């Protein structure tokens, strides 16, 4: 097989149609399902796969207590075909408390980070064998995307960060070929803090929309050149900002170069993508907490920072139901590259005390050139019944 190139144009998108739902928490109340968080979707040439960071335990288990912590030695990257829930037959592809995965057209690359907070190791596993590794450079929680990496002509790119993720000092873009790190570029341009990037092929380059945990409620953007390893960065212009927390839409502002300095602290992993001057994006419906989820197009929102003209809104999860991380993934069609996204539906501790565990289900949506209706697809488990 030849390497992927993603050279087809982006599909026409009128909104997103429902694609898949794992029902993991509902199934957990009567079966052996893995405790997970930080899920993501990625697809090979034929099939989409669901990935998640396991907590080394099933949900109906003594070890599911205190599973709110994000880093432990037992976290492993789980991998299944999309829609197959994480049952005991699930493969642990690597040891990882932070990860990214992608298929280059020949084989899967997994970027797997584990070890001490102060001195972590990133392992590069390709075609089922460990090919390379790199140690923490800022000695303060080396971490990556928690979503798919992107490969063009066999050169995969992954965004990685360390410390408080400050600009060129902490964030690096690694260029990887068949698991070997071939180049490493420091972050460049005006993005001040860059974490948990959601990346999509935008041939000839890769584009990433990220989380700013310190200054912006507007999201950072990275443009990555595959041919010369050059890096450019900025923020999503849109006056309707994508991060959580953020200011109310009636009072929020944004900037194309700088963080908006409005509810800059903290964030949530999310996504956005360009459609000429317009921007498609998803965010939690609630402005201060991860409740509900909505997607919409903002007219001129990729280039005009004063624009707040939204259209094509869809509620994916109603404003009363818990959401979580969300990320883009790209699927190659017959004549165009489609954009799809997943929403993590987090349940349990800290916000729900009925249970001792923290875990997620997922719902997955794909861009459509056709027409669609309305709905709400929340997790749907009753923690009052599966109560401790």
């Amino acid at each position, epitope marked *: 097989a030849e390497y992927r190139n993603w050279s087809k144009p982006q599909c026409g998108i009128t909104g997103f149609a429902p694609f898949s739902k794992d029902n993991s928490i509902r199934l957990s109340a009567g079966g052996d399902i893995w405790v997970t968080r930080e899920p993501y979707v990625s697809c090979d040439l034929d099939k989409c796969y669901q990935f998640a960071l396991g907590q080394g335990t099933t949900l109906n288990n003594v070890h599911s207590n205190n599973t709110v912590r994000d880093r432990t030695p037992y976290r492993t990257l789980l991998m299944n075909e999309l829609g197959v829930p994480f049952h005991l037959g699930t493969k642990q592809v690597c040891i990882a408390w932070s990860s990214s995965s992608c298929h280059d057209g020949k084989a899967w690359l997994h970027v797997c980070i584990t070890g001490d*907070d102060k001195n972590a190791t990133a392992s590069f596993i390709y075609n089922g064998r460990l090919v390379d590794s790199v140690v923490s450079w800022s000695n303060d*929680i080396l971490r990556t995307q928690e979503s798919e990496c992107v490969c063009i002509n066999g050169t995969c790119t992954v965004v990685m960060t360390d410390g408080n993720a400050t600009g060129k000092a902490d964030t690096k873009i690694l260029f990887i070929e068949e698991g070997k790190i071939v180049h490493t570029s420091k972050l460049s341009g005006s993005a001040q803090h860059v974490e948990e990037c959601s990346c999509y092929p935008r041939y000839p380059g890769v584009r990433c929309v990220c989380r700013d945990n310190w200054k912006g409620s507007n999201r950072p953007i990275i443009d990555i050149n595959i041919k010369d390893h050059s890096i450019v960065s900025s923020y999503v212009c849109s006056g309707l900002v994508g991060d959580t927390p953020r200011k109310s839409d009636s009072s929020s502002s944004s900037h194309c170069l700088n963080p908006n300095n409005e509810e800059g602290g903290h964030g949530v992993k999310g996504w956005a993508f360009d459609d000429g001057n317009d921007v498609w994006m998803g965010r939690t419906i609630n402005e*201060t907490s991860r409740l509900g989820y909505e997607t919409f197009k903002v007219v001129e929102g990729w280039s005009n920072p004063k624009s707040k003209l939204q259209i094509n809104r869809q509620v994916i999860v109603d404003r009363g139901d818990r959401s979580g991380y969300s990320g883009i993934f790209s699927v190659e069609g017959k004549s165009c590259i489609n954009r799809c996204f997943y929403v993590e539906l987090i349940r349990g501790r800290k916000e729900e005390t009925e249970v001792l565990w923290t875990s997620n289900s997922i719902v997955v949506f794909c861009g459509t050139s056709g027409t669609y209706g309305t709905g709400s697809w929340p997790d749907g488990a009753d923690l009052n019944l599966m109560h401790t």
Partner: antibody
Amino acid sequence: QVHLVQSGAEVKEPGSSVTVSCKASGGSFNNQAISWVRQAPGQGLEWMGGIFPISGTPTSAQRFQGRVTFTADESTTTVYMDLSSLRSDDTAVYYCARAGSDYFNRDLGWENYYFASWGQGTLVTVSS
Amino acid sequence: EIVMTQSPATLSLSSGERATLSCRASRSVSSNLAWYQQKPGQAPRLLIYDASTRATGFSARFAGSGSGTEFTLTISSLQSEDSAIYYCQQYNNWPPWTFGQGTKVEIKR
């Protein structure tokens, strides 16, 4: 019992630097974050920053992000706060304090970052 | 980021009266609120955490209550030792950990 012992009062000239220390009376530090809070004369409390004594992740408020750094050592069982490029206005009592918080989650941030135990408060004064 | 407003600025009541102090966050802090007592010339001391759990150093006469955006500290039957600056402090999951400007308590003997 764990309680904090601080470095004696300090006198410094403007533009200089000061090292303030905070030592555990219990012979060891657990991973509960040691934080620095200051109090200018006749004014309220102001959090400057902190560090976890074992896991090492340091954190700083914007008004101190350039001027302040934190370091820790289990052998001396002491956390050291360095304040650099001092000014007359930084004349204040500097208290080290132990937060309930003992882990940083990449995603969710810090639980229990309330100060449970406080040091004697090193009076730092800046003048010619 | 989150601003803490505390009132009254100064409060004065006689011994045996019940004092009430109030604290308001600029945005909801989800019960991540603590209260501190500072007697003159000493380090602050934790009164309350998680908006209502009182610390080992204080008796049931100190009652913390409220949630979301507004909180209150009630001091039942005032005693001579209660004259101190009282401060609220939010710790809603992300820095900075901002304190209230403080309430002076003065016993009207």
